């Protein structure tokens, strides 16, 4: 339950927040995490949950910490510590300067240039799935669209058989929102067990798929090793199957309850990209951290070498000191401040692919099924972790109010 308070941790800074099951979850995950920004909560607190760790609750500290990799290392970014210690994905488990070379390689598979190339493909898949659902007048968004849309795109880019999705998806979810069936370490070894043969095979016979590119790639001009390729492909796998997938659901859940906001985008489609950013802020969902490389005093608090600190990317944009009325969605928001895709040298590499998938989904969906709502009686439930999500999303609509495009 609660780990005994280390001697150096001030008693009054204790706030037992459980990132894998926050007290106020029933009100929504973001709402649940936002409790950390209530009037009497300090900028930096310590929770005795999940082994004990600090938590920066404000955008100011979160951004500052992510910028200072000398003090806050990516070496151990996962909580609990056991997970953080087993965590060796590339390039996230690395700090500059060595981290850099691997980011460049990762960009060969997800960089903007590559994304633009995927535009037509992405649109075709979205239109395909939406048009197929359109006449049915209902669907559980998570399994009918949120999951298949981005996962298939990734699997295709990676050149991996779709039959493998169920196993892979289970493993990725155990790494972000474990149900207890396995530790982060076990899910990782299983993910690596899956990739090892595939990488060797792609290295012997170079292809044009994401795996081949990484596996036969160069970093700083030298050949990447089989282990490095594995550590990187594993991370790309995680991004492709458990980020956009979840974000889309938070977004659609909101749109299914906001006729006014839907009409805005229906009226002026050119506002979709802006709406996408506001949604990325309001429904931010990632939260990992760093480990102190040495004793360091941060904002009046004595952090000790080895201490873990959660720096919730999700909280920055929800911070009222960053955005007035943070909980309100305003597609017209003048300055949409957020760190949804991270901050610092570890800025999300899949962010361009993510925005494309989000915008295409909004554009293609609202143009065919402008009017829809949450299936009556549905008690939408959220799930919390390194990456938060929605359990199920039952949507309904009158087929007569749709349009084939
Ligand atoms: C809504 C979608 C997404 C969000 C909010 C998101 C968020 C993030 C965040 C917050 C980080 C920083 C972690 C840290 O600093 O420890 C990150 C890193 C990363 N993400 Fe994204 N992610 C998304 C989608 C994706 C996708 C689809 C992919 C791959 C296809 C991806 C690949 C990566 C990679 C490779 C990194 C590591 C960068 C490094 O360590 O230098 N992400 N992402
Ligand atoms: K580690």
UniProtKB/Swiss-Prot annotation:
InterPro entries: Cyt_P450 (IPR001128), Cyt_P450_B (IPR002397), Cyt_P450_CS (IPR017972), Cyt_P450_sf (IPR036396). It is found in: Cytoplasm. It is an enzyme of class 1 (oxidoreductase). Its EC number is 1.14.15.1. GO terms for biological process: (+)-camphor catabolic process. Gene3D superfamilies: Cytochrome P450. The keyword Metal-binding applies. It catalyses: 2 reduced [2Fe-2S]-[putidaredoxin] + (1R,4R)-camphor + O2 + 2 H(+) = (1R,4R,5R)-5-hydroxycamphor + 2 oxidized [2Fe-2S]-[putidaredoxin] + H2O. One of its GO terms (molecular function) is iron ion binding. Pfam families: p450 (PF00067). One of its GO terms (cellular component) is cytoplasm. Heme binds at residue 348. Keywords: Cytoplasm, Heme, Iron, Metal-binding, Monooxygenase, Oxidoreductase. The keyword Ribosomal protein does not apply. Its main location: cytoplasm. It comes from the Bacteria. Pathway: Terpene metabolism; (R)-camphor degradation. Involved in a camphor oxidation system. Belongs to the cytochrome P450 family. This is Camphor 5-monooxygenase.
